[PDB]
Design an enzyme around this catalytic site. Structure first.
Site, PDB file in Angstrom:
ATOM      1  N   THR A  47       0.803  -1.087  -0.125  1.00  0.00           N
ATOM      2  CA  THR A  47       0.028   0.080   0.037  1.00  0.00           C
ATOM      3  C   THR A  47       0.917   1.242   0.015  1.00  0.00           C
ATOM      4  O   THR A  47       0.812   2.007  -0.943  1.00  0.00           O
ATOM      5  CB  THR A  47      -0.888   0.179   1.091  1.00  0.00           C
ATOM      6  OG1 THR A  47      -1.746  -1.162   1.253  1.00  0.00           O
ATOM      7  CG2 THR A  47      -1.817   1.143   1.286  1.00  0.00           C
ATOM      8  N   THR A  48       1.799   1.288   1.041  1.00  0.00           N
ATOM      9  CA  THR A  48       2.642   2.805   1.189  1.00  0.00           C
ATOM     10  C   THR A  48       3.707   2.472   0.294  1.00  0.00           C
ATOM     11  O   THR A  48       4.368   1.480   0.268  1.00  0.00           O
ATOM     12  CB  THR A  48       3.159   2.620   2.712  1.00  0.00           C
ATOM     13  OG1 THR A  48       2.030   2.872   3.564  1.00  0.00           O
ATOM     14  CG2 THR A  48       4.183   3.940   2.803  1.00  0.00           C
TER      15      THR A  48
ATOM     16  N   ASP B 292       6.166  -1.381   0.748  1.00  0.00           N
ATOM     17  CA  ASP B 292       5.451  -2.264   1.788  1.00  0.00           C
ATOM     18  C   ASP B 292       5.222  -3.710   1.321  1.00  0.00           C
ATOM     19  O   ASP B 292       5.457  -3.960  -0.108  1.00  0.00           O
ATOM     20  CB  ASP B 292       4.560  -1.878   2.837  1.00  0.00           C
ATOM     21  CG  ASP B 292       3.381  -1.569   2.139  1.00  0.00           C
ATOM     22  OD1 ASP B 292       3.429  -1.379   0.746  1.00  0.00           O
ATOM     23  OD2 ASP B 292       2.084  -1.673   2.611  1.00  0.00           O
TER      24      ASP B 292
ATOM     25  N   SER C 286      -0.309   1.011  -5.821  1.00  0.00           N
ATOM     26  CA  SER C 286      -1.142   0.919  -4.865  1.00  0.00           C
ATOM     27  C   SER C 286      -2.591   0.585  -4.981  1.00  0.00           C
ATOM     28  O   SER C 286      -2.946   0.730  -6.238  1.00  0.00           O
ATOM     29  CB  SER C 286      -0.726   2.039  -3.814  1.00  0.00           C
ATOM     30  OG  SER C 286       0.421   2.374  -3.524  1.00  0.00           O
TER      31      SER C 286
ATOM     32  N   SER D 132      -1.698   4.852   1.920  1.00  0.00           N
ATOM     33  CA  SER D 132      -2.761   5.215   2.747  1.00  0.00           C
ATOM     34  C   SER D 132      -2.220   5.591   4.129  1.00  0.00           C
ATOM     35  O   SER D 132      -2.733   6.703   4.832  1.00  0.00           O
ATOM     36  CB  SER D 132      -3.819   4.077   2.854  1.00  0.00           C
ATOM     37  OG  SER D 132      -3.200   2.950   3.598  1.00  0.00           O
TER      38      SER D 132
END
EC number: 3.4.25.1
Lengths: 250, 191, 233, 220, 240, 240, 204
Positions: free
Chosen positions: B1-2, B17, B46, B130
């Site tokens: 995500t990040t 990540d 992402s 996020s």
């Protein structure tokens, strides 16, 4: 591209259809079939141009092709050229059962296939069908019916036919045989035996080269009797004794 | 995500990540967000995984047939323009999380960010994910100008660790990607 | 007339014979010999592949291209338009396989392909297929061997042959092969009729013998070809 | 409905439950959700059946036109990209939730199929309603696969974990051994769930029922 | 035999022969080029050249070496106009297999999918047969290198060593006797025999800058060709 | 006997008569040449004068397709404007999906696939236009490509089409080309331009000149007559 | 509901050497009856039937559209129709509309044309094939169908006990439950002969 077009669809200067006249010359050759009036039944017979005995003959009905469990059609012409029309009319006969649930009558069945052969003659410059096949069946109105197809897109339907080359001596004899219907289904088949025995090129009435399929009207199954060639030989020798009996007069 | 992208003088440095969570449940514990478009051109993805894969596969087919016919170096800016045109027309359907960061022979290491709107812009650093909401103040301070590839691996580790530990969606094992003239370099770090 | 989209180029001769379709039979006659035999348990095919130069290796190009795992096949005459209908038959055999859920018999391959092959000849602007296909396989416990022609007419033969001097090899397959024999005996006379028009040299790469088992088609490697035929037949 | 599996050095073992429930009452007690992709590739079904069945039949039909192009033997990378390609072209209107695995020349590889088309490569994947129970065994107990046999037990340990925990997967255990040379499919593997015996004879003897109209149609 | 306008279109003949297709025999003659393919154990080597009538000729633009894939290149013959339209089609289906399939490309059967498009060119109602001749190399896993030469009749063809074209008929005559007998093939052995097989034809034997020698060997699987450097060294190595 | 009818058919000598008639169709048109220096590319066009004919600076065969690319065309003028719009629309697709300068190599390749395609079909007809493509960029440099109606894509340092004089490209090797800065090059080409193509055939004529390169920072435009004026200044005194 | 609109229940139970299939004769809209002489199960081929539960349109639509593709397969190949060939023939028909599919509960129970071995299967409205080794039940209420038959059906059941078991099963369900009723037709077919009996049911 006007010179490369041979004007197949377009007519001949003589008034005849230029492509159709050369088409029906193949119908006079190749396929050979016959038809006659019979009571409580109908018979069909054909002689193969594949009659050479090296075949397996595992196709069962070949020139006799059966379009539906209740209907068969004797074909004269190129096999695969006709096989396009077989499944077509088979689906036309099947789509009729779909929206109706009642057997397709023979009248509109022939006019439907003849227009398919006509569409290629009238436009598109496409190769017209050189296949002329017969029709048999039964309806609740007109009963037993016989029909024939023509390459020009016309139905050649009558109660008798001459196809396509031989049977000559029997042809004029059929006009003396014109007495309408009988059965004793074996008696009408006996008349068909003197046609195959006398008018064949090698004569001898070869049993493996010919096949006889008969439709017997039955309520409501309409059983079609397909002879296994085991009872054809006794049917061949049945009228050969009658033909030997017919020559006892003179 | 990040996701994170940092560009130095002789190339760019990327990081992402691993753990990806759908709702409360974790979909995958280890996931590589870097996309091997070409050796000199990578990107970080992402959001929806299905939308990021196919678009990356489309540009790989588009540019691949184009770049092989070129017999030329894999220009980064033109590859990102393919993402700019597609994400702009599909912006009402597809979700764009792609940020193009890669080294180019002519233009050097460059980073191009393509948000959900489909626009393309060049900046000295890129941010995403996020869990990046908490590190917005950390990324605008610790970051320095004229970074070196050495400390880029340290700085991207500081930006991911704060986002992965705080936010619940991001987490797992830390994976970094180094891009330079010497070729692709990857490593696995934790803690 | 009309477009120019290739309307039918096939016309009828004054006697009613096909023009360009009968000329495709000359390519079959001017092609390479291919033979097949339907006997007893299964069908056996014997083709002929000879390299025009010593630099050709037969291990790459394969004459036998089976349509299905249980269905083998060979051809005669002319390649370029052959692979078109082959892969077309691969896509066409799926409708019967997906809808009816069944290892489609060779008879249905004959009805569907020869109908499209006849439609291909009816369509002009294109040269008809000069390929005579021998369709074989095993269905319903009883195998079959079927021969097609450029015109689309399909026949059935115990032992059939095509190519140069196909009428001479057909009489040999009529005499030497009769009734039905085992697949091992079928391979024997299939090579003997192939050695008729074959050159004075027969090796593993000169002839390739395909066989259709009741268990389904299995293409034999050139190994088994040199083992049984060395010492041909 | 639960599907899970793990990958060992020389191959993969897949498994699924035989119980398929529609509503509150079990519909199909014995069901095989392992579908034939190709000789060396097998995939586990889940979610909507007729959607994935026609899918995997069209896939395998396309793969029959795909892998057979060059022949050889079917790689998964051929079927891999087709899934993310095709399933994304419909933007996820259908659904899959499948476990894809196969043994290639590069070695065995496992995948997790999602309805939106996203596929990820993992040595262990869990899908279905019992994916929470099958993951707890695969996640914490994972090991670098070593010799063959111990991973075949790891699947049966994870498959049985979802059967005894999640009430959605009952009936019989399934196991399929997929390796390079050897291919084994054993169904049913074990029947942990049983049905109680009848309390008596409920059979209804003749004479207590009247027939309105009878018909006799002899056959041939 | 010929009847009617059949001479003016592309179709069969009253005898079943072909005219248009057979006029593509000499369609290569206007180019006047030559390409010979030689394959070794782990290697495959292609030999070609180019004509420089004027000093304004650029070596890069008039280069006849075409690279389809990084791992697999190619070469053409005949008129270069029809060849370029087949270049992108060879690149097209390539990228299709790289995208969808994701591996080393149909090193064997790729000539079937290319000849299929090449047959569509021939099978079209009115269109140019595109008499350009396609020649490919190949790389596979533990199959060794591959060599394939396709002709624009719509069929797939390839073997160990194959040479077809204007003067390539005499080149294969030497390769038949050179390969076997019985012999092996090394890297420089295939490069040295690339000239000797042509030495049975013409081999004017001039500065190598005009001739281009394609080479593919398995160390790094990626296809590639040097510039002018050691090709001249391999030219002076074969002559002692 | 009619083998030249269909453009989709070959010839008894194994070539395309439609192209052979198209090659000499460009020769009957007035001369349009081209040359490339190190940092630039030069174009030129001759404008014939018979009666008047009309206003000077009309229907010039020099066109500008893109920022860094230009057109020096010969043959039928209407077929050239059609290819000018096709190359303009192709340059519009590149500046849209990508947004940077279209490389001259693939820009000629796109047109090479077009001009080749029209020669394959008998429906359409081949092209009677043989033009010149050249460009300069800071990251690319000066290249010049010669495209022929047959569809062959290639280029040299210079080429000449149009009328058969061909002596205007002879003195270029007698002068400094790649060494010169492209500035004085303009007036150095025009010397024999006036001398040859003698006034017996055409009493009067007119010359157009265009250039693209570093001095314009990649831009392409026709060099004005008033600036720098040394174009026709040195041309009148160099005739001897 | 959609299936509860016209109601109806199709219960097919396999015996030892034979197979039995039953369906109610009630035809009506919601709870209002129309006619009790409507026919649901239709003959297909020889010694093979099909059960249908759902909208009476899809009952007549599929059975007629199936009869279409029925013969066309038999006319091309004289061999029979097989229960497997006709099974997926409905599945391909129900899959013609993915998001628009017809609403029906087709139950195909018919004998093998080769041997007396019976076969039973049931398909979802979307075309999902399903087979059972005991019986296939499709109807409004699944509690009485699955509850009873699991305590009734036995592995080996002769035609005498096979018809009498489903007999009382329909008697106890109709006289108690509400939805179904108004007569039930039962088709029990074997290799030697085809037997069709109509069970007695309440008229209210």
């Amino acid at each position: 591209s006007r010179r490369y077009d041979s004007r197949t669809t377009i007519f001949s200067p003589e008034g005849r259809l230029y492509q159709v006249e050369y088409a029906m010359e193949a119908i006079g050759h190749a396929g050979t079939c016959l038809g006659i009036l019979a009571n409580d039944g109908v018979l069909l017979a054909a002689e193969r141009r594949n009659i050479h005995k090296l075949l397996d003959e595992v196709f069962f009905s070949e020139k006799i092709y059966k379009l539906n469990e209740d209907m068969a059609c004797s074909v004269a012409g190129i096999t695969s050229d006709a096989n396009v029309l077989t499944n077509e009319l088979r689906l036309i006969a099947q789509r009729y059962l779909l929206q109706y649930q009642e057997p397709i009558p023979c009248e509109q069945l022939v006019t439907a296939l003849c227009d398919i052969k006509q569409a290629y003659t009238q436009f598109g410059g496409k190769r017209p069908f050189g296949v002329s096949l017969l029709y048999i069946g039964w309806d609740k109105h007109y009963g037993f019916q016989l029909y024939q197809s023509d390459p020009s897109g016309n139905y050649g339907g009558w109660k008798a036919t001459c196809i396509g080359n031989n049977s000559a001596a029997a042809v004029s004899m059929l006009k003396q045989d014109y007495k309408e219907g009988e059965m004793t289904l074996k008696s009408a088949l006996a008349l068909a035996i003197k046609v195959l025995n006398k008018t064949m090129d090698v004569s001898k009435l070869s049993a493996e080269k010919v096949e006889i399929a008969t439709l017997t009207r039955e309520n409501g199954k309409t059983v079609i009797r397909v002879l296994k060639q085991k009872e054809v030989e006794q049917l061949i020798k049945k009228h050969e004794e009658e033909e030997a009996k017919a020559e006892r007069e003179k | 995500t990040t996701i994170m992208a940092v560009q130095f003088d002789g190339g760019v440095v990327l990081g992402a990540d691993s753990r990806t969570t759908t709702g409360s449940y974790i979909a995958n514990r280890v996931t590589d967000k870097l996309t091997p478009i070409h050796d000199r051109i990578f990107c970080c993805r992402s959001g929806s995984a299905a939308d990021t894969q196919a678009v990356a596969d489309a540009v790989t087919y588009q540019l691949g047939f184009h770049s092989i016919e070129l017999n030329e170096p894999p220009l980064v800016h033109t590859a990102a323009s393919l993402f700019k045109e597609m994400c702009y027309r599909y912006r009402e359907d597809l979700m764009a999380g792609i940020i193009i960061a890669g080294w180019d022979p002519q233009e050097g290491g460059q980073v191009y960010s393509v948000p959900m709107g489909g626009m393309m812009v060049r900046q000295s650093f890129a941010i995403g994910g996020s869990g990046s909401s908490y590190i917005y103040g950390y990324v605008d301070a610790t970051y320095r100008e004229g970074m070196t590839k050495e400390e880029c691996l340290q700085f991207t580790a500081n930006a991911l660790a704060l986002a992965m530990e705080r936010d619940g969606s991001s987490g797992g094992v830390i994976r970094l990607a180094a891009i330079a003239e010497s070729g692709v370099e990857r490593q696995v770090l934790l803690g | 007339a009309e477009r120019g989209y290739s309307f039918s180029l096939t016309t009828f001769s004054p006697s009613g014979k096909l023009v360009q379709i009968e000329y495709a039979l000359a390519a079959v006659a001017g092609g390479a010999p291919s033979v097949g035999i339907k006997a007893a348990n299964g069908v056996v095919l014997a083709t002929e592949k000879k390299q025009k130069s010593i630099l050709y290796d037969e291990r790459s190009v394969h004459k036998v291209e089976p349509i299905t795992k249980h269905i083998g096949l060979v051809y005669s005459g002319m390649g370029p338009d052959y692979r078109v209908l082959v892969h077309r038959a691969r896509k066409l055999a799926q409708q019967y396989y997906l809808v009816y859920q069944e290892p489609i018999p060779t008879a249905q391959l004959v009805q569907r392909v020869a109908s499209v092959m006849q439609e291909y000849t009816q369509s002009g602007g294109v040269r008809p297929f000069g390929v005579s296909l021998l369709i074989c396989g095993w269905n319903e416990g009883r195998p079959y061997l079927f021969q097609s022609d450029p015109s689309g007419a399909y026949f059935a033969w115990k032992a059939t042959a095509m190519g140069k001097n196909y009428v001479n090899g057909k009489t040999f397959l009529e005499k030497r092969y009769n009734e039905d024999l085992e697949l091992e005996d079928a391979i024997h006379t299939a090579i003997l009729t192939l050695k008729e028009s074959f050159e004075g040299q027969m090796t593993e790469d000169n002839i390739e013998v395909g066989i259709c088992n009741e268990a389904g088609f299995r293409r034999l490697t050139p190994t088994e070809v040199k083992d049984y035929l060395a010492a041909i037949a | 409905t639960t599907i899970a599996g793990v990958v060992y050095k020389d191959g993969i073992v897949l498994g699924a439950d035989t119980r398929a429930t529609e509503g509150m009452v079990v519909a199909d007690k014995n069901c095989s959700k392992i579908h034939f992709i190709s000789p060396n590739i097998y995939c586990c079904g889940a979610g909507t059946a007729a959607d994935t069945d026609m899918t995997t039949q069209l896939i395998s039909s396309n793969l029959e036109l795909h892998s057979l192009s060059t022949g050889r033997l079917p790689r998964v990378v051929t079927a891999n990209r087709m899934l993310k390609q095709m399933l994304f072209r419909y933007q996820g209107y259908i659904g899959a939730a499948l476990v894809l695995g196969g043994v290639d020349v590069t070695g065995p590889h496992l995948y997790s199929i999602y309805p939106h088309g996203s596929t990820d490569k993992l040595p262990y994947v869990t899908m279905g309603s019992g994916s929470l129970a099958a993951m707890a065994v695969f996640e914490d107990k994972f090991r670098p696969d070593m010799e063959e046999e111990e991973a075949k037990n790891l699947v049966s340990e994870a498959i049985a974990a979802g059967i005894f925990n999640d009430l959605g997967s009952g009936s019989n255990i399934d196991l399929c051994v997929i390796s390079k040379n050897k291919l084994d499919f054993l169904r049913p593997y074990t029947v942990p769930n049983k049905k109680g015996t009848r309390l008596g004879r409920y059979r209804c003897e003749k004479g207590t029922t009247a027939v309105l109209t009878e018909k006799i149609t002899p056959l041939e | 035999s010929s009847a009617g306008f059949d001479r003016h279109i592309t179709i069969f003949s009253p005898e079943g022969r072909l005219y248009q297709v057979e006029y593509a025999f000499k369609a290569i003659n206007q180019g006047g080029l030559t390409s010979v393919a030689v394959r070794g154990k782990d290697c495959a080597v292609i030999v070609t050249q180019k004509k420089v009538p004027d000093k304004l000729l650029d070596s890069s633009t008039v280069t006849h070496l075409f690279k389809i894939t990084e791992n697999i290149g190619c070469v053409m013959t005949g008129m270069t106009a029809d060849s370029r339209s087949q270049v992108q089609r060879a690149r097209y289906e390539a990228a299709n297999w790289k995208y969808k399939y994701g591996y080393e490309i149909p090193v064997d059967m790729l000539c079937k999918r290319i000849a299929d498009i090449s047959q569509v060119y021939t099978q079209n109602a009115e269109m140019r047969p595109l008499g350009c001749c396609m020649i490919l190399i190949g790389i596979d896993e533990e199959q060794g290198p591959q060599v394939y030469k396709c002709d624009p009749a719509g069929y797939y063809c390839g073997f160990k060593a194959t040479a077809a074209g204007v003067k390539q008929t005499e080149s294969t005559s030497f390769l038949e006797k050179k390969v076997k007998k019985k012999f092996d093939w090394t890297f420089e052995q295939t490069v040295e025999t690339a000239i000797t097989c042509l030495s049975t034809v013409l081999s004017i034997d001039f500065k190598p800058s005009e001739i281009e020698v394609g080479v593919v060997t398995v160390e790094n699987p990626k296809f590639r060709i040097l510039t002018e450097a050691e090709i001249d060294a391999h030219l002076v190595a074969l002559a002692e | 006997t009619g083998y030249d009818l269909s453009a989709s058919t070959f010839s008894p000598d194994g070539r395309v008569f439609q192209v052979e008639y198209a090659m000499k169709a460009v020769e009957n048109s007035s001369t349009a040449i081209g040359i490339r220096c190190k940092d630039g590319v030069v174009f030129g066009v001759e404008k014939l004068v018979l009666s008047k004919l009309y206003e000077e600076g009309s229907n010039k065969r020099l066109f500008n397709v893109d920022r860094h690319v230009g057109m020096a065309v010969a043959g039928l003028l209407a077929d050239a404007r059609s290819l000018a719009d096709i190359a303009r629309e192709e340059a519009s697709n590149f500046r849209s999906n990508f947004g940077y300068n279209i490389p001259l190599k693939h820009l000629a390749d796109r047109v090479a696939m077009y001009v080749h395609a029209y020669t394959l079909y008998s429906a359409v007809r081949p092209f009677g236009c043989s033009f010149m493509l050249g460009s300069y960029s800071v990251n690319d440099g000066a290249q010049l490509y010669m495209i022929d109606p047959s569809g062959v894509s290639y280029g040299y340092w210079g080429c000449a089409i149009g009328k058969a004089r061909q002596a205007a490209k002879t003195e270029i090797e007698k002068l400094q080309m790649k060494e010169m800065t492209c500035r004085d090059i303009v007036k150095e080409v025009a010397k024999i331009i006036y001398i040859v193509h003698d006034e017996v055939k055409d009493k009067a004529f007119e010359l157009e000149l265009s250039w693209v390169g570093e001095l314009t920072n990649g831009r392409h435009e026709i060099v004005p007559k008033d600036i720098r004026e040394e174009a026709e200044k040195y041309a009148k005194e160099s005739l001897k | 509901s959609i299936m509860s609109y016209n109601g109806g229940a199709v219960m097919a139970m396999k015996g030892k050497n034979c197979v039995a299939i039953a369906a109610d004769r009630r035809f009506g809209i919601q709870a209002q009856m129309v006619t009790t002489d409507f026919q649901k199960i239709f003959p297909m081929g020889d010694r093979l039937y099909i059960g249908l539960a759902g909208l009476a349109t899809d009952v007549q639509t599929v059975a007629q559209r199936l009869k279409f593709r029925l013969n066309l397969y038999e006319l091309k190949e004289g061999r029979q129709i097989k229960p497997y060939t006709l099974m997926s023939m409905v599945a391909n028909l129900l899959y013609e509309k993915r998001f628009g599919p017809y609403y029906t509960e087709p139950v195909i129970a018919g004998l093998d044309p080769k041997t007396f071995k019976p076969f039973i299967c049931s398909l979802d409205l979307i075309g999902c094939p399903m087979v059972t080794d005991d019986f296939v039940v499709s109807g409004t209420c699944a509690e009485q169908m699955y509850g009873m038959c699991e305590s009734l059906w036995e592995p080996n059941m002769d035609p005498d006990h096979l018809f009498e078991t489903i007999s009382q099963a329909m008697l106890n369900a109709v006289d108690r439950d509400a939805v179904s009723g108004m007569g039930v037709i039962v088709h029990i077919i074997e290799k030697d002969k085809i037997t069709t009996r109509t069970l007695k049911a309440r008229m209210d």
